[PDB]
Amino acid sequence: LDSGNVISDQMLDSSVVSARMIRLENGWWRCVLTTKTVSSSFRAAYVAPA
Amino acid sequence: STSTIRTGTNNDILLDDNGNMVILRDVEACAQDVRAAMLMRTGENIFDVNSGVGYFEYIFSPQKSYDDARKSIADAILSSPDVTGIEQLDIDITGEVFGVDAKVITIH
Amino acid sequence: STSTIRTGTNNDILLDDNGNMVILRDVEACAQDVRAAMLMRTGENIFDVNSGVGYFEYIFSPQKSYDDARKSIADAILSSPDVTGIEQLDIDITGEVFGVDAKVITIH
Amino acid sequence: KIPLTAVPNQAISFNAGSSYWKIRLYQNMDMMNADISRDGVIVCHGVRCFGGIPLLQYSHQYRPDYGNFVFDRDADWTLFGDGINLFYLDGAEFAEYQALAT
């Protein structure tokens, strides 16, 4: 959040392509994730603190 | 002036971690070749009969002089492409084992 | 029949008071040449290898016979344009120093 | 092909293509060099050697109807006789080879 670097992305399948962070005012940021997997079995999306 | 492919303690092609066959240069190739020649025995080389070591005729069979075995082994050590001459040969014959020791001379 | 340029106790051209290089005639030129030849060492003459005194292989290194050093020094004294033959050679090898003494023969 | 040997300096004469040839091969610094003479008359001096390109460069000399020479790879006097060869080609095949070059 504070520095603005995409730290870790993981490949279990052929899914991910790119990920990026963009600066916004007042401690706000936007996260983008691009996934291009051969299959189509999207089931759920999880978000949690680390 | 010689070269060959490396083999392990058993006489099979040995590959490195990278999976590439290695072509040994001289000296070491001479050692490998002389070991293989001494291990060959006569009677089975098609296209060249009467080459090898006469184990079953000159060593294992009961014999009179044992000079013939020395001659045959000396010939087998020779005929290598690089070997020039033999420095020593022992032929121990102690207990049950048939000791053999040799020191070979090469151009390089 | 020979000639050369005079040099001092160090191996450099020595000039007289007038500033003229002097061309030494025979006899003395022979002495200069033989001193230089014995001091010249092997493996240095480009365009003629195998000429000189083999100090590091024949004298300084531990050796078996020491005859080889005598032969090498005798050859080095020879090959001078004027030297004919060698009368004496000593090779004292007494104490710590390796003594050498010789007397040669010229045509004149 | 042209028989050779592993020697830093050499020169051979041979009769091929209904003409008399004499080639001198020698090493200069790093690259190899050649001297070519025909029928007792000098032709070229100090031409470098490379794999595939022809030895005779300027248009007039190489042929109205004669041939030319080409090394398979870069020259090296220590590899002559073992994996390095020199070949002679008369007019027809040299012409088709030159056409194939472009």
Add this chain to the structure above:
Amino acid sequence: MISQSRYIRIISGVGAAAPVAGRKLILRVMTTNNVIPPGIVIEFDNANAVLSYFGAQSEEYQRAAAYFKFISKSVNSPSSISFARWVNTAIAPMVVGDNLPKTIADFAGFSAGVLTIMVGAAEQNITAIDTSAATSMDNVASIIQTEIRKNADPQLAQATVTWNQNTNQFTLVGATIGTGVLAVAKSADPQDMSTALGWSTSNVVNVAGQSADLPDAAVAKSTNVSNNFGSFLFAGAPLDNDQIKAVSAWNAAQNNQFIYTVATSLANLGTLFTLVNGNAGTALNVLSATAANDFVEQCPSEILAATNYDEPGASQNYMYYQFPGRNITVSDDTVANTVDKSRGNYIGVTQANGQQLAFYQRGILCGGPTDAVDMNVYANEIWLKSAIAQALLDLFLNVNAVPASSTGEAMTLAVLQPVLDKATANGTFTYGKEISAVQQQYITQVTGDRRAWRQVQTLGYWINITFSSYTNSNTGLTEWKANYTLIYSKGDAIRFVEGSDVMI
């Protein structure tokens, strides 16, 4: 279909293989590396083994790589090297017991009831440890560390664990420093780690916590463990003057057993020479401040280790050997004269502007007036002493009794004869040298017999054996002892050449 090796077996092997039995003259390096246990010495036969055990980044690998690649005039190589540890500071107790590649992650299924027994000051046991996961050996090491920390013993309350990879050992470390003893024992529980782990099984190295010690004590203990070496050395950081002086004195206490080689700079020679006047067996070498060390101090050790003593014509000179890898230190006559007066060794350059010549020049060695100064004489005396001692012990162990009569002394001569023959064929003895008047007087003073100087001039040695009686300090009783005296002409090597020629 049954195998060749049951009937015919050829071992082959590259040339230059010389089987040898007897005293070995090889380098010994005292290091402050943590990996080496204090009480064990290790011998290697190749640079690759050192690389595998220590790793490329280590200084020791560089030292060994420089050491092994060396050829003498007669083609020879050191073919061996030894290592030992010197503890610089106080250390905690520790254990280590694995050498073989047991670790292939077999901890799976071993979680239930881990009951490794740790025999500390008071007997204590460990509780069940989960190893069924067996994800990684560092993970299970941390797990074991945490379970050990669960104990309340002062030593195990802050213990640590470590696993090395290129070599395969598991190590424990105590909490306090300088005191304490640990031990480990197996139990009757079928699924125990100690049997699978390196420790508590057969050859396991154990360490007792103990304070810092002087280097001389460390080398003395190392010798007490084993003494099959020559020309030991300290690696790592340079030592101060006082420690070097102490080590030199301790080495001089032994009579011609090893060589002490050290490295130093030009500015430092003025101090050391005054301190270490006499004290034979110590070599001084000049080191360059500007460039890398290049390990100049190893040169005499390599030269000595390359020497073969059984074959004839063995004695070699130290004045002219070329080391292409090393750098150059001195290039002027004045500095060379000062260094020679200071009895130092160096690699001097004779020229530039063409092929260079440089060589390890001075074969001299600091010592008192009585003792030998040249290096080759020192090495020859070392070998001679070893051979004589071995022959005498063989005699004592073989014959049933040695009577104190003429027969006994005859037996002693008979036994010593082959060693003297080997020596005179080797080159440590010399014949034909001229004897000065003062030398003749000295010889006659040492041995009561006159005309022995003629013997040492002709053959090169003179021996005599007599027997007497004495009483030992430990017990009031008396025994019989034999005394011999040996005088021989020292070997020499060419250093300087004199010549002259006359036209007629």
Add this chain to the structure above:
Amino acid sequence: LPAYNSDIQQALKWLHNQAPGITGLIQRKAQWYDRFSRQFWANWERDVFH
């Protein structure tokens, strides 16, 4: 009258008993030629038989 052997496996010798590699290579070449050189002729003649 003298016998003709014509066997591929004649190349294997004493020195190759515990060798899985070279022996496997030669043997595989052997059944390759067995499949595509002689059994082919047998099938061909059995088919050309009217």
Add this chain to the structure above:
Amino acid sequence: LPAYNSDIQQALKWLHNQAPGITGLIQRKAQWYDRFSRQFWANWERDVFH
């Protein structure tokens, strides 16, 4: 493949160490040829270098 040295200083042999005269003469010839034979070629190449 064999190395070619082509150096003037090779003429000096180590009978000549304490000689200021002959060594100085040879060396001065050496930088003369260095200046006017090869550094010339380097400068010419760099100038004709388009």
Add this chain to the structure above:
Amino acid sequence: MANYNYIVDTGVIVADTADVLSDVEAEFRAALGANINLAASTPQGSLVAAEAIARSSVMRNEARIANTINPNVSFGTFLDAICALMGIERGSDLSTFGYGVQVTGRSQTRISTGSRVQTPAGAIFTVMSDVTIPAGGVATIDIKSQEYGNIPLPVGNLIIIDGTIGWSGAKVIASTRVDPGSRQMSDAELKNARVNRLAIQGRNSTMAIKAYVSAVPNVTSVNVIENNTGAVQVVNGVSFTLPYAVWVCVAGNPDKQAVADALWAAHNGGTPWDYGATNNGVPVDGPNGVPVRDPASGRKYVVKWTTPIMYDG
């Protein structure tokens, strides 16, 4: 006096070292006297040696660069000769990385120049030392041993030179990935590129068009004709004075854009593209075939090509 004019019309001449040595010996012998001594040890012998080496070296070096304009030459002079048209050298780069993954014990430093390996046995070195967070995650910087355009597989790595308790050389796709150039064109493919360019420039307008379109995938046949006049020449070309009268056949034109791209390469420079007489081959599109602007620092252009009328026999 004793000079040899070793440069002649035919070329440059080189003599054996014995000949130049003998010539220098003759020069000094005439310089001083017939009774002089010429050996290595004596100073004048050293002068002979120095002179012979100098003469031979300078003469050989001059003979080295006797011919340069001919494209047989190499090593810099040829580099500039080819770069006059087009040519890249150096390209000697090795792919430095970023965002490595390392897990190990707490509060430790990995010494620089550690060794890591990939499954096809590629050796990769590290760059700079760093501490390890107690969590067990840090970022590393890598480099390889050989300076080659290596392709490292995205697989968990193996450590060759191992520090203490440091494992799991691991990848992350967040790592910056660099493709390194590796001496791609040394000495001969430069000549091949020169040959290709001179072949390109040799063809005229029509030949270039037909050659380029012949290279387009799935294209079967092409016909090209130039009116060069406002009258009829083969068909009713009266549209402009000098258009391109172009017809192309294909088995489907899988790459519509690429067909225009090939055409865009071939343009004379003063002649338009549009064609049509309301009866000739049907154009694909009316005003334009929507080409690409320019692969190399450029803007839009427009072209025009037609297709034949299908028939059944």
